[PDB]
Amino acid sequence: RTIGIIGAPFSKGQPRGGVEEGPTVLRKAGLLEKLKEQECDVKDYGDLPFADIPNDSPFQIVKNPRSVGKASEQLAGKVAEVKKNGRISLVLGGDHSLAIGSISGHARVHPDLGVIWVDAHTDINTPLTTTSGNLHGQPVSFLLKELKGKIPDVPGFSWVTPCISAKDIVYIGLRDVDPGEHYILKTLGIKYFSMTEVDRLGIGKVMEETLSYLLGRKKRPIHLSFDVDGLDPSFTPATGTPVVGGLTYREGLYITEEIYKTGLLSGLDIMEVNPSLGKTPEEVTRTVNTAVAITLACFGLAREGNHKPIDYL
């Protein structure tokens, strides 16, 4: 469809820095050209400038709360802009803490959006349940309204307003969920398909239930937050928190091909691609190649082929 690309070179949501290079390598792989090579009206809003916030001491256990809170605030406004421009926002990260601004900004122009979260983790720890202190593992806790009250006033997020309900989101691919996170999942009744459910039903039924769950009552704009560590590390090794037994390349593409076909995709996140973590230059291209493949699927690239409304014979 009509795309609005925005680069988000941010890494302060976690320890390993090379993730802020994601935009660079994803663009070098020729993402723009590839998109344009389709029914895509592409406008790159460039890379957001994430100014240094030198004085950002931990809030209790939470690290770099201000630079994170700031990076998400800046992105929220940018996403809202591209949406007001009638364009599908494509945010290239950058660590997953940015989802806070991406989804918030999306919910401003489209408060009825539905979220599909592909990840190996649920990223729903609260500033109080997290043990690591890394904000790229808490983005979800800031957006849920039902958790409005368990989120302390962390410096940098006083602009945040929970914008989604526990039932407006579906997780797919989970395989490393903390105890407090699992508790929250069962308590708020969050719909999820861990790797156990994917193995059980098959990726087809999984998506069928997902789209039906989020679009059942009525059609709403869709937001896909794709963490690359959601796929098995044999496909996307250059990422910070890899977990074996992930979604295959095929399941990765099947999810996006299906979402694309809904025609309701309005927001997309490609997160956690960290080139510095590749053990070899091949693991690096293998990660970026895969991250690009999943992106092109979101916008039309089908494995059975594509063709223009013309007579080829």
Next chain:
Amino acid sequence: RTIGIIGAPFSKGQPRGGVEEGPTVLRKAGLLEKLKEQECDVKDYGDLPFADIPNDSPFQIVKNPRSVGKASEQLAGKVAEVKKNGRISLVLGGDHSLAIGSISGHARVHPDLGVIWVDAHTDINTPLTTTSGNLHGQPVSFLLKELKGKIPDVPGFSWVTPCISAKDIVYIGLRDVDPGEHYILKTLGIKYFSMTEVDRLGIGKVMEETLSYLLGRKKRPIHLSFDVDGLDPSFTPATGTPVVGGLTYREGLYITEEIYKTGLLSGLDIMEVNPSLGKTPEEVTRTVNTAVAITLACFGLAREGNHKPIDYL
């Protein structure tokens, strides 16, 4: 069943030459002995002699049309021979352009045959829609009757007669289909199961629908044209046009085990094995080992075991 092996060391359907070695390595892996190690009456018709055709300038964009047209013509007669001998023709390639002669020759003794095409591609470009000019990506266009009129008189194929309908064939494993090819697929209503449908239904349902589709109305001889690049390159890397996200080793064997059980297998093609393309000697044996495994399945080798009609206790 009763087999008729024929070697087809041909490569002129494409650029990379080492594919004409397929017969050699497939036999060195001990294919004959393996087959004989079963309920197989094996007769090797040797390797066809593909005489040099030095004067073979391109026909427009089409490369080596005469040597290709000749190689397929020679094979067609050989396959017809082994079939008239009441034997399941097993053609070891060689690039996929040979399918033209294999299927044509098969259709002479068994004009009612049904075709199952396992490949990452549809190989249905016409001399006019192809952009590469490589004939191993156009074999299908010469055999379909509905395309009788969109195929120009290319030097070397005036012996060709479309022998199959758009509904006598089922593709399985597609993941890199050109635009003109996709157009033809939807226009002639060709039945196909790209990697998207395999992921959706599961390999079991896929085959179930395939066999039911081709054998529904009535039982007919079956022709299986297996391109090794149909399977994921992690299993068959030594091939010319590999595409990630392919059929697994297991799905590869499940397809053949199922076809075998139909008891209607009459023609088999093992194509695109190119040893020169192996990055290591292991990728080479890994490709040939896999190509052999799929062949033995076609003739009885079952993963649950096999035993002779005797009392082992």
Next chain:
Amino acid sequence: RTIGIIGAPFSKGQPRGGVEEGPTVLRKAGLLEKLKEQECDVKDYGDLPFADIPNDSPFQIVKNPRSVGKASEQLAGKVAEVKKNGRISLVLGGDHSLAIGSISGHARVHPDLGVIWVDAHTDINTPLTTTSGNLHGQPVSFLLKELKGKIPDVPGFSWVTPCISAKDIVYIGLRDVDPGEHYILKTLGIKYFSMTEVDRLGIGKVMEETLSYLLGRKKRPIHLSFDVDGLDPSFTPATGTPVVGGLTYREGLYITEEIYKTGLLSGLDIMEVNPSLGKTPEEVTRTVNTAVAITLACFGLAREGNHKPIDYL
């Protein structure tokens, strides 16, 4: 649940020796600590002392019958002990010949047990049908009552009493079954899901049918004999008899997560882990890492997460 760990450093059921190290590396990977890190009351009964039996000439074709028969006899008593202690026996092997003592000892305190055998092989050759002579490929033949009469008096097993029926066991993952073994399977009507049935139905339906088959008539204690070569060698390479096209890591965990949820697991076997066979130190840790993962699943570790009966918010 409440566990009773027993080390079984035995290798005389086959040729390659490094398998008797299994207990050592599985414990070094910190298995005990991991188990304890759950709702597990763990008591390690140490490693059984498998005294040397220098004079153990082959019985016809059968190798090391006395040391094998002795090792299984010793284990049977140890398993019976831990069971009488109201604990789920967790036997770390060691080659698969030990299953004879593990299952026998289990059947003493729980004669109504049901067996689930995950392996690439059926290990049901008789001292008379085996061609290799290796007892780790015959454990099943000594336990079936219906085969009481086809088992010659092999030195070291006069203590053995067939303790299970042909219908009290279900095989999962088969892909290399001898002819005599296949004959026995079809003759005694043994329920099995080779890799062909897993591909067909999907791992979910497979387990569903398995648990329903063994628990259909009524709930009974379950014995899971897990051979690591059951999983594809890309996950567990450090094992003696690897076969490509195995169960994935995911299917490996799905099987155990499901069994765990039955709540009827009473006996568990982790066999064939041979560190000496790793081609690299990574294949070694990759094998042991995987062998540990499947073990923790058996006792509660779920991929969707876990949490204590408390309020995390």
